[PDB]
Structures are given as C-alpha cells and as structure tokens.
Design a protein around this ligand. Structure first.
Ligand SMILES: Nc1ccn([C@H]2CC[C@@H](COP(=O)(O)OP(=O)(O)OP(=O)(O)O)O2)c(=O)n1
Ligand SMILES: [Mg+2]
Ligand SMILES: [Mn+2]
Ligand SMILES: [Mn+2]
Ligand SMILES: [Mn+2]
Ligand SMILES: [Mn+2]
Ligand SMILES: [Mn+2]
Ligand SMILES: [Mn+2]
Length: 542
DNA sequence: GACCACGGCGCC
DNA sequence: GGGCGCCGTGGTC
C-alpha cells in the first residue's frame, strides 16, 4: 500500500492544519521550537518556525488560540480558526487536553510538529463527523466557541497593567505583620514549628493544646485545621485568631503580592494570563499562569492587591458585572413565577438575605455584607446543609432548616426544575444548558448515596452555571468588534464580569455601550441587568 | 531541579 | 453548595 502522508516543501497551501512545538505551555513566554502544516495527504515542515509564521493566513488545528497568541506577541495578525479541541469539548467537556482528545478521537499527541499537524487534520475530520446532526453543538461551535477563541487570543496578547512598585512595597509591609503573628503563634504554642504545615499545626492544636477536633479531611482523614474548624474554635484559645490572621496574610503574600510582579512580560510591560477554553465541566472559562480570575476582593489587604491592577496612563478601566446572574438564569430555566416577579420588581435577593443575616434594614447593608449573602444564597440553592448553614451564620440548626425550607417554598418551581433536570440526566446520561451544552454525569446512577447525591448537586448546578457561561461568551463575541472600532481593549473575563481598558475621553461611551451589549445579548424571561463602574484601578472601577 | 496528592483557600 | 487554579508541604524521583 502507498504511504498515507508525504512530506512536501514549506509553505503549505491555504486551509492547511498547523502543528507546532513550544518550549513551554504558556504562549506569551514560549519559544516556538517547530512549526508544520498538513493538508490532503502532505505534511510541510517549516525550515525556521518564526519566519514561517508569516506564511500562514490562519492557525487551524489543535490549540490554535495559543499559536495565535504567540503570533500576536511577534506582531503578526494570525487569527485562530478551527480547532478540534473545541469540537471535542462541546461533545464532552471532560475532553480537556490534547493528549486525551488525540487518544479518544484519532491517534496520539507526540512531540513533533508535523505529526501534530497531521493529527490536527484527522481529528478535525473525525470530530466534525461526530457532530453531524448535533445542530445545537454546531451552533455553539460556529457562533460562540470558534469566534471566542480569536477574542481570547487578543485578550491574552494584550495583558493588563500592574503597579509593580506598589506591590513590592506592600510585600515588605506584610512580611513584618506576618512575623508578628507567627511569633505570637509560637509564644502561645510554647515552641516554634512550621506554621505553614497543616500536619505540624494539627499536632499542636489537638495533641499539645488539647483543643477539640471538629472535622476530618476528605482523602486522608486527618483532623482538619481548615478556616471553618478554626472559626468554630476562635473563643477556645487565643492562638486561633492569630493563626487565622497569619493564614490570611500568608495566602495573599505567597499567591499574589510576591509572584505577580515577577511575571511582568519584558516586551509588553504587562501581565498576561491564559484563558483556557476547554478546562471546565460546565462551559466556564478558566484563567491560569497566573490566575487572574481569583484576585482578592473581600478583605482589606485583599482589596489593596486589587488596587494594583491599573489602567494605562491616559486610560481607564471599565468593569461590567451581570447582576445576580445565576438567580436570573434560574428564573428563566425554571419558569418560577415568583422568581421571575422578583426581577420584574427590581429586587435584590442578596441584599434581602444580608438584611436578615445581619439583622439590619436593607438600606444599611453594605457591599461586603451583601457579598457575604452570596455564599448563603448560592450555597442554599445548590444544596448546602442546615448544619453548615447554622455554623456559617451562628444560628441554631432549627433556624437554618427554616431558612432552607422558606427559600425553596418561595420559589416552588425550582424544585420541579431540579427533578426534571435529574431525570433527564439519568436517562440521557447528561444534563444541558439553555443552548444545549452538555455535561455527562454518570454517577447520577451511583449506588453509594454520598457519591450519587454529590453527582446530583453537580448536575443541578451545571445548566445554571453553564447557561450563564454561554451568555457571557456570546456577549464577548458581540462586544469585541464594537470595542476594536472605538479604540478600546477587552482585558479580562471573570465569569460574569468583563474588565475593559478605554481611553479617558471615550470611557463613559464605552461603558454605556458595553453595558447595553451585555444586557441585550440574548433576552430571557427576566431582564439581565449589568452593573458598570469606571476607574483608574480595578477596585475603584467596582 | 522535577513530579504528584493533599489540604487549604483565593475568586466566580 | 457548585465551578476553578495556586500555594506550601510531604513524599518521592
Ligand atoms: N459564592 C458564589 C459566588 C458566585 N457563584 C456563581 C453564581 C453567581 C456567579 C457570579 O458571581 P457574582 O457576580 O459574585 O454573583 P452575582 O449573584 O452575579 O452577584 P452581583 O449581583 O454582585 O454581581 O458565580 C457561586 O456559585 N457561588
Ligand atoms: Mg461577578
Ligand atoms: Mn509538551
Ligand atoms: Mn493612571
Ligand atoms: Mn455578578
Ligand atoms: Mn434541554
Ligand atoms: Mn486590541
Ligand atoms: Mn485539589
């Protein structure tokens, strides 16, 4: 039999599938080691990869977005196009890696660019075939995921400005506060130990100081030293508050204050995350290297850190955040008339819960009190126990149970939608979003109750979180070209929030426009309301 | 140096 | 409660 794949000289014809090898996975930081392309039955290998990038009109193939990011870094406008990872991810969002997708759908992810190109081509063919007749998944691919990949490449290449000297100064200040706390912890324990070691702390708290253990850890069943356990022990011994404070500051310093300034890119002078498009079971994006979707916001030090994310000189940040997003989406999905009415009347369920929680009038609820109510409202919605709710609010168990009962009694059709969702997931093997994005949940049939019930909580959540994800993605695709036209920049997505950068002279017009695009994206049974703020830094913009 | 699993915890 | 990614530790190679 004749050979299946022939080598031919660079450059490839238009429409070819690319393969490429990076020195490291992060495209803003990677050296392009090899580039190749495949089409029909030929493979073309680039003599010198960087120069050869200039020969391509489009990056089509596995991880197309990442090659596009690298090209943009080098000042080339090479947009991403088809990518089999996106097809695979829509078929089953457990398809998250090229290694796994290759094995499942047609071969092997190797370390050679030509092989990667040929792999890209055959995977695309095979996965296109698998989507035959999947009209809703195809619509998601063509209208959302494929165009979104080009938006994400542009965002990644743009980056965000960081106040490096501010964070360097903050490190020195927090180091002194950490030393005070750790020293006090050791004074109170009677000796030093590694306070970063939860194993060493466990022995200190429960074996040496004789404090009561409250909870156990999941995989190894050690006595937990989690914040929930420490909070329960706060009045038992003065060491506990000191450990909580030490943990707060060390978490911020080790995760954000110290690492972020070291990640400023030498070419751009900015901070560049990865927006991972095939990483979550629900259709959300993720952000990594560094994660810019978990920048602190709740504590005073945390807020200091958020102040380091700044606009370029002469620009402003614009932050837009969907109000009460998953409660609105749930209203639509469930058709609950009471929940629909809440939003028709302009009510805020987080503010109402905060009022009850803190025992103050709604007018007296401040933003951090309202924020605290989110874990309560979403926790309860998605199945939090009365035991946990009682601990979290320091109320009697019976009062926590009453809250839970009243919450679902208020929105009677939510329970009906839960049962419909679970039956469908049992029968089909998967649950789905409004747009038809699917998540397979085989443990809905598990015979171990704890395993099955966990699966049920995963399954009930997915259509709500995932529909919210679908809406935000669609909004990004519609908004991006509007911003390009106005000389504004899309910088960050944070699940139901976008952070943009706009010249000062155009910032108010950009904010107004972006708000309207987001609110009007895909109308539901309730209004989608967007909160918008403008500022020189991310804290000020919210 | 690197890997991972884990506990833990930051955000949505 | 659900969804993530990164930290340091500990064990390991
Ligand atoms: N503890 C949380 C916080 C958030 N989310 C999910 C549901 C809401 C969504 C977006 O987060 P927020 O913007 O913080 O929530 P919101 O209800 O949209 O609040 P806001 O009106 O302040 O934007 O992420 C969740 O499941 N659990
Ligand atoms: Mg938000
Ligand atoms: Mn590799
Ligand atoms: Mn400024
Ligand atoms: Mn929101
Ligand atoms: Mn459906
Ligand atoms: Mn741009
Ligand atoms: Mn984990």
């Amino acid at each position: 039999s004749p050979k299946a794949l022939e080598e031919a000289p660079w450059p490839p014809p238009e429409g070819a599938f690319v393969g490429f090898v990076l020195s490291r996975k992060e495209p803003m930081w990677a050296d392009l080691l090899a580039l190749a392309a495949a089409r029909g039955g030929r493979v073309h290998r680039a003599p010198e990869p960087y120069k050869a990038l200039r020969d391509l009109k489009e990056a089509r193939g596995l991880l197309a977005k990442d090659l596009s990011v690298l090209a943009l870094r080098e000042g080339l406008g090479l947009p991403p196009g088809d990518d089999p990872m996106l097809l695979a991810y829509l078929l089953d969002p457990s398809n998250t890696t090229p290694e796994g997708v290759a094995r499942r759908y047609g071969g092997e992810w190797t370390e050679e660019a030509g092989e990667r190109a040929a792999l890209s081509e055959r995977l695309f063919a095979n996965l296109w075939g698998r989507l035959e007749g999947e009209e809703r998944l195809l619509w998601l691919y063509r209208e959302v995921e494929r165009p979104l990949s080009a938006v994400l490449a542009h965002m990644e290449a743009t980056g965000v400005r960081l106040d490096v000297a501010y964070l360097r100064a903050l490190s020195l200040e927090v180091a002194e506060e950490i030393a005070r706390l750790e020293a006090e912890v050791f004074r109170l324990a009677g000796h030093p130990f590694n306070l970063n070691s939860r194993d060493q702390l466990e022995r200190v708290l429960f074996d040496e100081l004789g404090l009561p253990a409250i909870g156990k850890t999941e995989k190894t069943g050690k006595r937990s030293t989690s914040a929930a356990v420490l909070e329960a022990l706060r009045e038992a011994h003065p060491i506990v508050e000191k450990i909580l404070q030490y943990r707060e500051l060390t978490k911020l310093k080790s995760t954000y204050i110290d690492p972020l300034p070291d990640l400023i890119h030498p070419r751009t002078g900015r901070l560049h995350t990865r927006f991972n498009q095939t990483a979550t079971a629900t259709g959300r994006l993720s952000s990594s290297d560094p994660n810019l979707q978990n920048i602190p916001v709740r504590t005073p030090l945390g807020q200091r850190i958020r102040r380091a994310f700044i606009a370029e000189e002469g620009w402003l940040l614009v932050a837009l955040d969907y109000s009460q997003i998953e409660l609105r989406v749930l209203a639509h999905l469930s058709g609950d008339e009471n929940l629909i009415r809440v939003f028709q009347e302009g009510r805020d369920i987080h503010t109402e819960t905060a009022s009850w929680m803190f025992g103050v009038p709604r007018e007296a609820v401040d933003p951090l009190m309202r924020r605290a109510a989110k874990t309560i409202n979403f926790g309860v919605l998605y199945g939090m126990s009365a035991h946990r709710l009682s601990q979290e609010l320091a109320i009697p168990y019976e009062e926590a149970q009453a809250f839970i009962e009243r919450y679902f009694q208020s929105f009677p059709k939510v329970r009906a939608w839960l049962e419909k969702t679970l039956e469908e997931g049992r029968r089909r093997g998967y649950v789905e979003t409004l747009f038809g994005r699917r998540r397979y949940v085989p443990d809905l049939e598990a015979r171990v109750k704890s395993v099955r019930e966990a699966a049920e909580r995963m399954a009930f959540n997915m259509p709500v979180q995932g529909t919210a994800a679908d809406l935000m993605k669609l909004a990004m695709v519609k908004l991006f070209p509007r911003l390009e036209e106005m000389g504004a920049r899309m910088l960050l997505q944070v699940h139901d929030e976008l952070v943009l950068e706009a010249p000062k002279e155009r910032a108010e017009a950009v904010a107004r426009l972006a708000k309207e695009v987001m609110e009007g994206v895909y109308p539901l049974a309730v209004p989608l309301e967007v909160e918008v703020g403008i500022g020189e830094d991310w804290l000020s913009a919210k």
